[PDB]
Design a protein. Structure first.
Length: 277
């Protein structure tokens, strides 16, 4: 039997743009259950993340006044975000086409799935939801270096699309914005949204001897596969957000062509030139 997935179920009776896929955030659709689920997830992460999340992330939560007790009003959040870095969040139905996603980031709009996981899915949801997209991704947009990195990433979509290289950019996004670590004098910390919204990947990625922690390298990352349904086997570590922005400086086109005829590293592989931490 095939049943409708959660994205389909949540969006019944709603619409979105055929070209850019946004909709007004549907506040009427959040039930008391949703606000309680949000509050529980927020509480859970706020207990776990001190000393694990990077300090910029924690400060972003407070500066943006992300509600602890209810799903946030995107419009209210935007007032603070816009004044900080000129970015805004836009509501989308769920996963959107790549070219639309890049056009959004290139224009300083960050797409956020509007709906929330059901209470029985508190521990984990496969598809992004509003807790992962808002709590996980948005606080760092207050940081001008990180915000400029996302904008530069977005701007690179047109070239990647023209060259059949969108999956190579997707690897960069996955291993930085979703699953990145940052080294600090206080020790390793987390900036990746997929880790920051997780029940326990925050514990594994810093505490476990199992995953590889490898120094950031652009070419290596764009040649590295990832899986979506397990903890990461490798995490890439930056020294500063400036390193990410600076990595977007060169022309990616010759990098894409050289990678196009390479075999990619598996998610668990250690490459010969890896700086292993
Ligand atoms: Co549709
Ligand atoms: Co994400």
């Amino acid at each position: 039997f095939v049943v409708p997935d959660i994205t389909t179920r949540k969006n019944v009776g709603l619409s979105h743009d055929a070209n850019d896929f946004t909709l007004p955030q549907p506040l009427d659709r959040y039930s008391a259950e949703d606000h309680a689920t949000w509050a529980t997830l927020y509480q859970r992460q706020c207990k776990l993340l001190p000393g694990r999340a990077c300090d910029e992330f924690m400060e972003g939560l407070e500066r943006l006044e992300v509600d602890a007790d209810r799903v946030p009003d995107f419009n209210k959040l935007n007032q603070k975000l816009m004044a900080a870095t000129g970015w805004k969040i836009v509501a989308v139905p769920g996963l959107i086409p790549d070219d639309v996603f890049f056009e959004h980031l290139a224009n300083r709009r960050f797409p956020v799935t509007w709906w929330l996981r059901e209470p029985h899915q508190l521990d984990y949801l496969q598809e992004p939801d509003v807790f992962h997209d808002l709590f996980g991704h948005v606080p760092l947009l207050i940081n001008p270096v990180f915000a400029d990195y996302l904008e530069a990433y977005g701007k690179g979509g047109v070239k990647a699309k023209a060259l059949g290289a969108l999956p190579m950019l997707a690897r960069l996004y996955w291993y930085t914005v979703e699953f990145g670590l940052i080294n600090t004098p206080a020790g390793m910390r987390i900036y990746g949204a997929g880790i920051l919204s997780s029940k326990s990947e925050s514990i594994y990625c810093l505490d476990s001897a199992s995953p590889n922690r490898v120094g950031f390298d652009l070419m290596r990352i764009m040649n590295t596969r990832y899986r979506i349904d397990t903890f990461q086997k490798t995490y890439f570590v930056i020294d500063s957000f400036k390193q990410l922005f600076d990595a977007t400086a060169p022309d990616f086109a010759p990098l894409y062509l050289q990678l196009a005829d390479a075999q990619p590293w598996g998610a668990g592989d250690v490459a010969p030139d890896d700086l292993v931490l």
